[PDB]
Amino acid sequence: PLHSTM
């Protein structure tokens, strides 16, 4: 994924 958890 491009970033951690929203």
Place this chain on the structure above:
Amino acid sequence: DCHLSDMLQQLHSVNASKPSERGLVRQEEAEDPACIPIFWVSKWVDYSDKYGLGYQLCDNSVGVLFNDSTRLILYNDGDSLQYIERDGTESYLTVSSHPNSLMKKITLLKYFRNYMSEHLLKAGANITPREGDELARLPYLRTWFRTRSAIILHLSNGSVQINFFQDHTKLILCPLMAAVTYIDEKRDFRTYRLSLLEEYGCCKELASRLRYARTMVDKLLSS
């Protein structure tokens, strides 16, 4: 690197004992709150495409590891900075007295901070860092790599953290404490001393993750 071997040895040791094969598993017996981590990565973003990996540590500080092997840290007073060059040369700056040599990198770091602050959740929000050693200093991201299932973060203090994308389970390994912090899918966390897991054992889920962990350490180690 000296610490990755410690970990490796620690993981070899606990995995080798097949913790999930005990006649009876008494996982709660492996717990040790005096081992709770001081720092871990609470949130991250990836621009390794055009700049680098931006991340926030549990104590709200923000750091960036640029593709050019340099790190810029912004401590939680929203002003103190620490630039670390490839050769390891550390230097202090301030966003208040924003330099000219790193305006671009400070603006980037400020963009990540704003992004992580608007869309990202804070992993371990319910954890309380321990009153650990005070002469210890804030760690920076040494190196990181991703797989199809998880992201692996290596911190300058020796800790390695693995965040699993699908179930959202995480691991925070510390070779100094010889312990592992597991955060399950329900966001509940627990810290165990690896040697104790060796004695009392653990469930299927924590054990497969400790096997996958030795694997990722091996990958960190051979790079």
